[PDB]
C-alpha cells in the first residue's frame with residue numbers, strides 16, 4: 001500500500017512523524033499488510049495553493 005496525504009503547511013516535524021506512524025499502523029492493521037510494505041508520502045500544501053469553495057486556505 002502507498003498512501004499520499006495532502007495537508008496544509010505549518011505543522012511540526014514531530015506531528016508529521018506521528019501522522020506517518022499512525023497511518024501506517026492503521027493500513028497494516030486494516031489490511032493484514034506487512035508494515036514494511038506500507039509507504040506514506042506527506043505532501044504539504046502552501047496556504048495560497050489550497051482552495052475550498054474557490055477561497056484560499058490563506059483566507
Ligand SMILES: *[C@H](CF)CC(=O)C(=O)O
Nearest residue numbers: 001002033036037038039
Ligand atoms: C503496497 C502497495 F500496494 C504494497 C507494496 O508496495 C509492497 O508490497 O511493497
